[PDB]
XYZ file of C-alpha atoms in Angstrom:
691
model
C -6.353 23.475 22.985
C -9.000 26.009 23.943
C -11.898 25.722 26.366
C -14.875 25.818 23.985
C -13.366 22.663 22.500
C -13.516 21.015 25.922
C -17.150 22.054 26.330
C -18.055 20.557 22.952
C -16.030 17.396 23.570
C -17.819 16.807 26.872
C -21.228 17.416 25.288
C -20.543 14.916 22.508
C -19.189 12.429 25.041
C -22.467 12.711 26.951
C -24.497 12.132 23.788
C -22.471 9.084 22.771
C -22.847 7.806 26.333
C -26.609 7.993 25.894
C -26.370 6.149 22.582
C -24.237 3.417 24.134
C -26.760 3.179 26.967
C -29.600 2.505 24.539
C -27.367 -0.019 22.765
C -26.631 -1.735 26.077
C -30.347 -1.926 26.852
C -31.233 -3.380 23.462
C -28.531 -6.025 23.911
C -30.001 -6.684 27.353
C -33.582 -7.235 26.223
C -32.358 -9.141 23.170
C -30.373 -11.608 25.270
C -33.458 -11.863 27.478
C -35.851 -12.686 24.631
C -33.091 -14.971 23.340
C -32.866 -17.000 26.545
C -36.664 -17.147 26.592
C -37.069 -18.332 22.994
C -34.338 -20.858 23.735
C -36.016 -22.357 26.804
C -39.639 -22.720 25.630
C -40.804 -20.215 22.964
C -44.213 -21.877 23.209
C -44.526 -22.361 19.465
C -42.939 -24.624 16.869
C -39.356 -25.680 16.206
C -39.037 -23.675 12.992
C -40.417 -20.480 14.512
C -38.051 -21.128 17.414
C -35.010 -21.434 15.155
C -36.031 -18.331 13.211
C -36.419 -16.226 16.356
C -33.157 -17.589 17.769
C -31.216 -16.701 14.630
C -32.822 -13.262 14.368
C -31.937 -12.362 17.940
C -28.430 -13.719 17.400
C -28.020 -11.400 14.414
C -29.223 -8.511 16.561
C -26.732 -9.405 19.303
C -23.893 -9.610 16.789
C -24.778 -6.344 15.057
C -24.901 -4.480 18.364
C -21.709 -6.099 19.658
C -19.878 -4.961 16.530
C -21.507 -1.521 16.651
C -19.901 -1.064 20.080
C -16.572 -0.425 18.310
C -16.798 3.118 16.973
C -20.524 3.784 16.905
C -20.714 7.468 15.913
C -18.447 8.405 13.013
C -19.415 12.043 13.137
C -22.067 14.677 12.818
C -23.717 17.163 10.474
C -25.007 20.660 11.197
C -27.313 21.882 8.434
C -28.209 25.438 7.480
C -31.576 25.076 9.243
C -29.731 23.971 12.415
C -30.817 20.334 12.614
C -28.256 18.026 14.176
C -27.529 14.715 12.508
C -25.367 11.989 14.034
C -23.892 9.366 11.719
C -22.895 5.882 12.760
C -22.850 2.200 11.912
C -26.253 1.681 13.533
C -29.633 3.365 13.340
C -31.015 4.528 16.672
C -34.474 6.105 16.820
C -36.775 7.150 19.651
C -39.927 5.021 19.576
C -41.603 7.775 21.622
C -41.225 10.905 19.460
C -42.265 9.167 16.237
C -38.824 7.631 15.674
C -36.883 10.880 15.547
C -33.395 9.853 14.340
C -30.930 9.955 17.209
C -28.265 8.199 15.143
C -28.252 7.650 11.388
C -26.819 4.650 9.620
C -24.187 5.787 7.134
C -26.062 3.758 4.493
C -29.006 6.114 4.610
C -30.180 8.442 1.820
C -30.065 11.120 4.537
C -26.496 10.569 5.790
C -25.178 11.202 2.279
C -23.924 14.787 2.787
C -21.162 13.279 4.900
C -19.255 11.383 2.186
C -20.126 13.427 -0.914
C -20.564 16.998 0.345
C -17.986 19.669 -0.467
C -17.580 23.380 0.232
C -18.752 24.382 -3.267
C -21.488 21.805 -3.945
C -22.937 21.062 -0.514
C -26.454 19.699 -0.216
C -27.901 21.744 2.622
C -25.066 21.533 5.134
C -23.149 24.063 7.189
C -20.615 21.781 8.872
C -19.238 18.257 9.161
C -17.571 16.706 12.209
C -15.541 13.536 12.496
C -14.918 11.838 15.846
C -11.730 9.897 16.586
C -12.644 6.899 18.734
C -10.708 4.059 20.295
C -13.465 1.609 21.182
C -16.076 3.573 23.109
C -14.485 6.961 23.837
C -14.401 10.199 21.856
C -10.755 11.254 22.024
C -11.027 14.295 19.765
C -12.975 15.594 16.798
C -12.465 17.769 13.746
C -14.800 20.239 12.072
C -14.938 20.642 8.292
C -16.965 23.719 7.389
C -18.564 23.578 3.941
C -18.111 27.233 3.087
C -15.926 30.049 4.420
C -14.168 29.627 7.793
C -12.981 32.246 10.253
C -11.528 30.188 13.103
C -12.287 26.587 14.087
C -11.112 25.177 17.400
C -9.588 21.892 16.204
C -9.163 20.390 12.734
C -5.951 18.277 12.858
C -4.919 20.098 9.679
C -5.718 23.742 10.572
C -7.168 24.194 7.075
C -9.814 26.583 8.396
C -7.530 29.251 9.863
C -5.357 29.198 6.729
C -8.340 29.404 4.373
C -9.305 32.537 6.343
C -5.953 34.380 6.385
C -5.738 34.983 2.636
C -4.412 38.521 2.159
C -3.950 39.477 -1.491
C -4.394 42.570 -3.675
C -7.933 43.610 -4.484
C -9.028 43.186 -8.082
C -10.202 40.158 -9.983
C -7.903 38.445 -7.497
C -8.243 34.998 -9.071
C -11.981 35.197 -8.377
C -11.989 35.651 -4.592
C -9.184 33.235 -3.759
C -11.241 30.914 -1.548
C -13.974 30.153 -4.085
C -11.410 29.065 -6.677
C -9.745 26.599 -4.297
C -13.104 25.205 -3.229
C -14.257 24.756 -6.822
C -11.016 23.035 -7.813
C -11.358 20.604 -4.914
C -15.001 20.039 -5.864
C -13.980 19.222 -9.434
C -11.475 16.657 -8.171
C -13.876 15.025 -5.711
C -17.252 15.048 -7.509
C -15.624 13.704 -10.684
C -17.089 10.731 -12.566
C -14.257 8.706 -14.084
C -14.037 5.654 -11.792
C -10.636 5.018 -13.356
C -7.176 6.573 -13.024
C -6.922 10.168 -11.837
C -3.775 12.218 -11.295
C -3.777 15.164 -8.907
C -0.325 16.515 -9.677
C -0.347 19.848 -7.899
C 2.410 21.037 -5.638
C 3.117 22.239 -2.118
C 0.660 24.168 -0.023
C -2.562 23.042 -1.685
C -3.796 20.083 0.371
C -3.616 17.478 -2.381
C -3.529 14.607 0.127
C -6.665 15.599 2.035
C -8.378 16.098 -1.324
C -7.324 12.614 -2.418
C -8.733 11.171 0.799
C -12.068 12.942 0.346
C -12.054 11.609 -3.216
C -11.552 8.078 -1.913
C -14.440 8.568 0.508
C -16.722 9.753 -2.295
C -15.783 6.716 -4.377
C -16.079 4.175 -1.557
C -19.561 5.458 -0.773
C -20.828 5.819 -4.343
C -19.431 2.456 -5.492
C -19.609 0.782 -2.081
C -21.069 -2.308 -3.767
C -18.248 -3.343 -6.085
C -15.802 -2.341 -3.367
C -16.557 -2.927 0.361
C -15.086 -6.420 -0.071
C -11.838 -5.441 -1.833
C -10.269 -2.654 0.225
C -8.286 0.525 -0.277
C -4.534 0.130 -0.704
C -2.707 3.327 0.234
C 1.037 3.287 -0.339
C 3.351 5.989 0.923
C 6.997 6.896 1.445
C 7.193 6.476 5.233
C 5.177 4.944 8.095
C 5.088 8.361 9.773
C 3.130 9.688 6.806
C 1.059 6.500 6.778
C 0.027 6.959 10.404
C -0.744 10.596 9.624
C -3.047 9.356 6.854
C -4.648 6.730 9.086
C -5.226 9.546 11.577
C -7.103 12.001 9.322
C -8.655 9.334 7.109
C -12.435 9.597 6.560
C -14.907 6.832 7.278
C -14.543 4.216 4.509
C -17.618 2.711 6.139
C -17.606 -1.080 6.487
C -14.410 -1.133 4.408
C -10.791 -1.343 5.505
C -7.555 0.189 4.284
C -4.122 -1.394 3.906
C -1.139 0.906 4.347
C 2.179 0.235 2.663
C 5.382 1.690 1.280
C 7.699 0.683 -1.507
C 9.550 -1.842 0.604
C 6.673 -3.834 2.100
C 4.911 -4.861 -1.122
C 6.054 -8.385 -0.188
C 4.263 -10.550 2.399
C 6.429 -10.670 5.495
C 9.486 -8.413 5.217
C 9.741 -4.654 5.783
C 12.799 -3.156 4.089
C 14.038 -0.060 5.928
C 14.972 1.828 2.755
C 18.508 0.613 2.137
C 18.306 2.444 -1.221
C 20.695 0.591 -3.512
C 22.555 3.254 -5.526
C 21.753 5.090 -8.735
C 22.804 2.225 -11.018
C 19.811 0.290 -9.701
C 17.927 2.780 -11.869
C 18.178 -0.138 -14.307
C 16.039 -2.109 -11.841
C 13.299 0.509 -11.860
C 12.803 -0.360 -15.517
C 11.050 -3.081 -17.465
C 14.102 -4.251 -19.418
C 15.058 -6.000 -16.170
C 12.347 -8.553 -16.952
C 14.551 -10.024 -19.676
C 17.374 -10.242 -17.131
C 15.121 -12.204 -14.790
C 14.002 -14.469 -17.623
C 17.668 -14.747 -18.609
C 18.773 -15.361 -15.013
C 16.020 -17.969 -14.605
C 17.342 -19.865 -17.649
C 20.978 -19.980 -16.522
C 19.528 -22.103 -13.704
C 18.568 -24.795 -16.221
C 22.230 -25.740 -16.169
C 23.321 -28.131 -18.888
C 25.465 -31.180 -18.019
C 29.064 -30.911 -19.174
C 30.355 -34.068 -17.503
C 27.978 -36.999 -18.163
C 26.088 -37.929 -15.008
C 26.565 -41.580 -13.938
C 23.423 -43.704 -13.661
C 23.609 -46.919 -11.633
C 20.218 -48.589 -12.019
C 21.962 -51.943 -11.501
C 22.604 -52.541 -15.208
C 22.151 -49.294 -17.116
C 24.784 -46.938 -18.487
C 24.685 -43.184 -17.952
C 21.902 -42.183 -20.336
C 21.641 -38.429 -19.700
C 24.082 -36.110 -21.455
C 24.139 -32.872 -23.446
C 21.758 -34.370 -26.010
C 19.249 -35.570 -23.412
C 19.417 -32.517 -21.151
C 19.292 -30.162 -24.141
C 16.259 -31.928 -25.607
C 14.432 -31.887 -22.277
C 15.236 -28.255 -21.435
C 14.096 -27.181 -24.898
C 10.816 -29.070 -24.590
C 10.261 -27.749 -21.059
C 10.785 -24.203 -22.313
C 8.390 -25.277 -25.108
C 5.191 -25.238 -23.033
C 4.898 -21.620 -21.881
C 4.627 -21.823 -18.109
C 6.739 -21.308 -14.966
C 10.035 -22.906 -13.989
C 9.085 -24.912 -10.901
C 6.053 -26.301 -12.733
C 8.282 -27.099 -15.727
C 10.477 -29.475 -13.727
C 7.556 -31.807 -14.439
C 8.183 -31.937 -18.186
C 11.952 -32.083 -17.698
C 11.580 -35.205 -15.557
C 8.918 -36.683 -17.836
C 11.257 -36.377 -20.818
C 14.469 -37.505 -19.122
C 12.656 -40.544 -17.698
C 10.938 -41.238 -21.028
C 14.275 -41.315 -22.862
C 16.080 -43.144 -20.033
C 13.497 -45.944 -19.789
C 12.052 -46.454 -23.281
C 15.576 -45.933 -24.656
C 17.277 -48.123 -22.043
C 14.936 -51.139 -21.915
C 15.413 -52.170 -25.547
C 19.196 -51.760 -25.112
C 20.420 -52.877 -21.688
C 17.676 -55.126 -20.320
C 18.050 -57.784 -22.976
C 17.310 -56.091 -26.306
C 14.862 -57.067 -29.043
C 12.557 -60.075 -29.739
C 9.509 -58.768 -27.847
C 7.299 -56.004 -29.244
C 4.492 -56.080 -26.675
C 3.544 -57.077 -23.129
C 7.176 -56.896 -21.983
C 8.602 -53.747 -23.563
C 5.357 -51.786 -23.250
C 4.690 -52.312 -19.529
C 7.048 -54.565 -17.590
C 10.579 -53.288 -18.191
C 8.903 -49.928 -18.745
C 7.528 -50.135 -15.211
C 10.664 -51.483 -13.528
C 12.943 -48.847 -15.059
C 10.427 -46.065 -14.382
C 10.148 -47.035 -10.723
C 13.811 -47.705 -10.010
C 14.373 -44.208 -11.379
C 11.555 -42.412 -9.530
C 12.898 -43.568 -6.146
C 16.569 -42.619 -6.668
C 16.318 -39.586 -4.385
C 20.119 -39.745 -3.964
C 21.689 -39.182 -7.407
C 18.947 -39.066 -10.054
C 17.010 -36.508 -8.030
C 20.130 -34.734 -6.796
C 21.153 -34.698 -10.459
C 17.897 -33.028 -11.496
C 18.070 -30.522 -8.633
C 21.543 -29.839 -10.028
C 20.105 -29.271 -13.521
C 16.547 -28.030 -12.934
C 16.688 -26.668 -9.371
C 13.479 -25.988 -7.507
C 14.393 -22.478 -6.389
C 12.825 -19.368 -4.906
C 12.963 -15.596 -5.435
C 14.907 -14.940 -2.232
C 17.916 -16.886 -3.567
C 18.134 -15.965 -7.263
C 18.927 -12.321 -6.572
C 21.703 -13.551 -4.276
C 23.170 -16.181 -6.604
C 23.037 -13.508 -9.340
C 24.182 -10.265 -7.690
C 27.442 -11.952 -6.599
C 28.620 -14.632 -9.049
C 29.538 -12.141 -11.807
C 29.234 -14.980 -14.330
C 25.545 -15.839 -14.021
C 25.156 -12.066 -14.227
C 27.045 -11.886 -17.524
C 24.901 -14.778 -18.782
C 21.751 -12.659 -18.290
C 22.430 -9.590 -20.427
C 22.854 -8.007 -17.028
C 25.229 -5.092 -16.349
C 27.871 -5.098 -13.614
C 26.945 -2.032 -11.530
C 24.354 -4.156 -9.690
C 26.997 -6.409 -8.117
C 27.286 -6.167 -4.342
C 29.027 -8.160 -1.631
C 26.010 -9.543 0.243
C 23.249 -11.127 -1.813
C 20.589 -10.473 0.839
C 21.077 -6.826 1.770
C 17.685 -6.512 0.122
C 16.892 -2.943 -0.891
C 13.757 -1.147 -2.044
C 14.545 -1.695 -5.729
C 14.773 -5.504 -5.470
C 11.378 -5.948 -3.786
C 9.328 -5.807 -7.021
C 11.858 -8.256 -8.464
C 10.825 -10.738 -5.773
C 7.116 -10.312 -6.485
C 7.759 -10.646 -10.223
C 9.770 -13.837 -9.698
C 7.066 -15.787 -7.855
C 5.157 -15.537 -11.153
C 7.982 -16.791 -13.394
C 8.867 -19.656 -11.045
C 5.379 -20.235 -9.698
C 4.897 -23.143 -7.344
C 5.427 -26.879 -7.701
C 3.119 -29.651 -6.492
C 5.204 -32.671 -5.469
C 7.254 -30.762 -2.904
C 4.138 -29.140 -1.442
C 2.419 -32.519 -1.104
C 5.410 -34.089 0.644
C 5.791 -31.023 2.861
C 2.192 -30.854 4.054
C 2.393 -34.635 4.540
C 5.369 -34.340 6.885
C 3.658 -31.393 8.591
C 0.530 -33.499 9.134
C 2.533 -36.358 10.630
C 4.352 -33.805 12.802
C 1.167 -32.269 14.210
C -0.129 -35.827 14.691
C 2.929 -37.199 16.502
C 3.038 -34.327 18.995
C -0.457 -35.205 20.270
C -1.263 -38.753 19.144
C -0.352 -40.643 15.975
C -2.941 -42.999 14.535
C -3.887 -40.993 11.427
C -4.941 -43.205 8.526
C -9.926 -22.908 9.842
C -12.623 -20.314 10.413
C -10.445 -17.353 11.405
C -12.312 -14.457 9.803
C -9.477 -12.004 10.201
C -10.273 -8.414 9.367
C -9.856 -7.197 5.809
C -6.531 -5.425 6.346
C -4.925 -8.582 7.715
C -6.467 -11.126 5.353
C -5.227 -8.850 2.554
C -1.712 -7.856 3.629
C -0.983 -11.578 4.073
C -1.589 -12.128 0.351
C 0.036 -10.748 -2.779
C -2.670 -12.479 -4.842
C -5.098 -9.817 -3.663
C -7.158 -7.546 -5.892
C -8.093 -4.283 -4.235
C -10.905 -2.067 -5.442
C -9.040 1.213 -5.225
C -5.500 2.470 -4.694
C -4.228 5.783 -3.350
C -0.620 6.762 -4.033
C 0.905 9.893 -2.520
C 4.327 11.168 -3.536
C 3.989 8.752 -6.425
C 6.903 10.168 -8.411
C 9.191 8.124 -6.137
C 8.016 4.913 -7.822
C 9.357 2.868 -10.706
C 7.920 1.141 -13.764
C 8.133 -2.148 -11.870
C 6.339 -0.658 -8.861
C 3.398 0.379 -11.033
C 3.545 -3.003 -12.748
C 3.009 -4.547 -9.322
C 0.254 -2.103 -8.370
C -1.603 -2.592 -11.658
C -1.329 -6.312 -11.082
C -2.995 -5.575 -7.737
C -5.849 -3.376 -9.011
C -7.186 -4.584 -12.388
C -10.123 -2.172 -12.109
C -7.529 0.613 -12.538
C -9.148 2.872 -9.955
C -6.057 4.731 -8.755
C -5.949 8.222 -7.200
C -2.332 9.081 -7.903
C -1.028 12.173 -6.126
C 2.373 13.759 -6.481
C 4.554 16.524 -7.834
C 7.307 15.589 -10.269
C 9.372 18.597 -9.168
C 9.457 17.248 -5.586
C 11.177 14.036 -6.651
C 14.109 12.436 -4.847
C 14.613 9.206 -6.780
C 16.697 8.126 -9.799
C 13.878 6.028 -11.178
C 11.298 8.740 -10.897
C 8.749 9.843 -13.458
C 9.838 13.056 -15.233
C 6.290 12.762 -16.663
C 3.183 10.669 -15.975
C 2.338 9.333 -19.434
C 5.635 7.448 -19.308
C 4.477 4.966 -16.674
C 0.722 4.999 -17.332
C 0.121 4.887 -21.096
C 1.522 1.351 -20.857
C -1.455 0.480 -18.625
C -4.116 3.171 -19.142
C -3.601 4.962 -22.475
C -5.969 7.830 -23.185
C -8.092 6.657 -20.238
C -6.458 8.587 -17.376
C -7.451 12.051 -16.211
C -5.060 14.753 -15.051
C -6.388 17.312 -12.590
C -4.337 19.991 -10.880
C -4.342 22.128 -7.746
C -2.852 25.484 -8.642
C -3.412 27.612 -5.536
C -1.252 27.541 -2.410
C -2.663 28.388 1.015
C -1.058 25.920 3.457
C 2.452 27.238 2.720
C 3.160 30.980 3.098
C 4.049 33.247 0.208
C 7.310 34.336 1.839
C 8.587 30.821 2.571
C 7.890 29.988 -1.084
C 9.327 32.990 -2.943
C 12.746 31.459 -2.242
C 11.793 27.916 -3.225
C 10.536 29.367 -6.503
C 14.104 30.325 -7.401
C 15.406 27.085 -5.898
C 13.152 25.534 -8.553
C 13.757 28.195 -11.218
C 16.518 25.724 -12.033
C 15.878 22.258 -13.485
C 14.114 22.970 -16.782
C 11.713 25.396 -15.086
C 7.961 24.834 -14.973
C 4.961 26.494 -13.337
C 6.983 26.707 -10.126
C 4.831 29.369 -8.411
C 1.436 27.826 -7.534
C 0.052 31.358 -7.084
C 1.241 31.701 -3.511
C -1.259 33.533 -1.310
C -1.640 33.837 2.474
C 1.014 36.471 3.056
C 2.116 36.060 6.672
C 3.618 38.678 8.979
C 6.892 36.881 9.729
C 9.740 36.787 7.256
C 12.270 33.923 7.225
C 15.804 34.396 8.554
C 19.352 33.034 8.628
C 22.239 32.593 11.057
C 25.931 32.054 10.329
C 27.259 29.185 12.447
C 30.866 28.459 13.350
C 32.318 24.924 13.314
C 30.644 23.703 16.511
C 28.436 26.465 17.876
C 25.800 24.471 16.007
C 23.861 22.537 18.659
C 23.915 25.658 20.831
C 21.846 27.223 18.027
C 19.376 24.454 17.173
C 18.572 23.965 20.856
C 17.314 27.555 20.966
C 14.896 26.878 18.104
C 13.829 23.641 19.801
C 13.267 24.963 23.323
C 11.469 28.073 22.069
C 9.209 26.044 19.790
C 8.483 23.994 22.900
C 7.054 27.325 24.040
C 4.729 27.023 21.044
C 1.991 24.447 20.467
C 2.980 23.221 17.011
C 5.287 20.635 15.513
C 8.814 21.920 15.012
C 10.862 19.168 13.367
C 14.398 20.035 12.241
C 16.074 18.706 9.097
C 19.737 18.185 8.306
C 22.266 15.747 6.871
C 22.660 12.297 8.442
C 26.029 12.969 10.090
C 24.691 15.645 12.443
C 22.890 14.274 15.526
C 19.463 15.432 16.604
C 18.306 16.306 13.072
C 16.583 14.066 10.537
C 17.099 13.833 6.760
C 14.747 15.605 4.331
C 13.356 12.283 3.047
C 11.125 11.366 6.004
C 9.320 14.718 5.800
C 8.450 13.629 2.271
C 4.708 14.244 2.435
C 4.096 15.931 5.783
C 3.617 19.430 7.144
C 4.879 21.106 10.292
C 4.423 24.458 12.009
C 7.976 25.809 12.180
C 10.841 24.175 10.296
C 14.592 24.691 10.542
C 16.912 23.393 7.830
C 20.644 23.537 8.521
C 23.439 23.132 5.978
C 21.483 23.693 2.741
C 24.516 22.860 0.637
C 25.588 19.432 1.890
C 22.036 18.207 1.326
C 21.855 20.027 -2.012
C 24.991 18.214 -3.207
C 24.069 14.929 -1.495
C 22.477 13.622 -4.690
C 21.995 13.987 -8.440
C 18.675 15.644 -7.570
C 19.374 17.059 -4.119
C 18.127 20.569 -4.668
C 14.787 18.764 -4.851
C 15.254 17.614 -1.257
C 15.969 21.242 -0.389
C 12.876 22.533 -2.207
C 10.974 19.822 -0.326
C 12.385 20.876 3.043
C 12.009 24.646 2.631
C 8.331 23.908 2.076
C 7.115 21.469 4.747
C 6.715 24.552 6.937
C 3.516 26.565 7.158
C 4.266 29.436 9.585
C 8.001 29.963 10.173
C 11.306 28.882 8.641
C 14.928 29.331 9.629
C 18.230 28.373 8.048
C 21.725 27.942 9.487
C 24.545 28.333 6.950
C 28.164 27.726 7.934
C 30.069 30.130 5.675
C 28.403 30.517 2.267
C 24.971 30.141 0.710
C 24.064 28.249 -2.466
C 23.228 31.841 -3.581
C 19.584 30.998 -4.367
C 18.842 31.716 -0.690
C 19.795 35.403 -0.523
C 16.053 35.832 0.029
C 16.741 34.920 3.654
C 18.008 37.651 5.973
């Protein structure tokens, strides 16, 4: 929040004001020539129409360009400013010297594809954060070595500069190694599935976003009409992403979590318990298929038919035959009602005419059509018993009700190979783990036709009666909204951060979303808090992308101090240890600390932290168990960073779960400058490092 930043912000605001002025003037003269061409134009009708349309396209392009004109700027090594935007603005006076580049130019390229190790000729890159016409703030991104940069929104520059480590080979001058790793991730040519499993303190999310920018520019022609689906653990993290997200020029993202994969409902992480780990697994499919067959109930008592002469014709033989044949076509349930009814009616008309009507003595022209027709019709209209009977046997049903009629009955459950740990009182306390079971069910059940016809009919005669009854579109919503309102959407790319928190069924859904398999999976298995988890990547991916997925890593740590992380090393030296130290560098000058609390001198101690951090200018979120007030769990800080962090009661949160020490290792690490702990009486003994 310095002063030089204010100077620069005002300068850039002035420049963008000038650009908007020129845009206003071009709209002015274009509307003027438009009015003119419209009135007379002098010439011919076809020339007139052509000029009209051309000026209309100009008007529209400029109108749109009013919303976030300048994306950012480039400073090259020869000190030549470049300004990037969604519109090219040149000065007709100085030989068309670019005042604003279009991002689609071969000269605005070192803004999507330039790194700090393979730049093109650049020294810097700025992004501007606009609302509609105003430059709120900006962020520099130096393509080289930083010393101190006023504002970045991620402070990467001041951390990349405070790297104090022993002289020597020193991992090849720490900075260069980080930059080259990032370059490898971003300038990579796979256009398929990449994994960036790294760890804490290495900027894997920013790297993934730069990667997505590189891809959406390079292949902006297969994408640019598909989107970028970015899932995440929490909307806080998703807004963070949306806030430091690069251009994605003329494309649009769609943010999500596990919980809103469905059109319409936004589960607030009810988190059905660990037994639902059998839901984050593909075996469950059988259960669904077995719970969608127990709905083809077979008649035990014979259903009475009363077509004015006919005896009850449907019974275990008839229903069995029809259900078998309906299962004998290979297609959904609600579209299979068709064959069920075709067969029941076939065997209740052709096999009731020659019995109950009169009998035999006519082999044509009466049996074939007439009694055929009468029986058929009298049956098709019986919307009282015949149709109620079918709805009793072959019910037209929906995903939102099967889970409920299954998770409670305890008999339909047993008839599905299903276990009994998934039983719960309410059948609509929908959790995160039963979302992908609702998106999978719309594809087993599908969608009927008859009901839809009748429904839209009634709807038509309801919109026609409200206004006037004698009966006898263009909304071009933006990409995000046209997409999120459709599960039958195929994106062109998919980012996934903290992707270890997902389940086989989640990836099944995602890979049904992106068939191009252009994911950018981020994560760290050892930061997992989920009993469906990964425990390895090949598990979930080889089933979709075998041998065709790349695994890149980010080994160095610079965004998380070396002191804060020496402890988390031991906190992770448990759990079948792995490369737990990502070569921590950036030794700070502050060591962490501790404080022994009494029963309820607790708020009197967190308030000190809070009101002193208020004296700072950095985020200071506190973490703790749910019972305590004023402190949040460690599961909403899943993929964020803060400036100073205070975790209280390490042990209750450690024991909170089967993998709770992972929540602790997560929470000791969100910090980047300072960390404090408050322990009641005893430590988990892996925290002696704190004093």
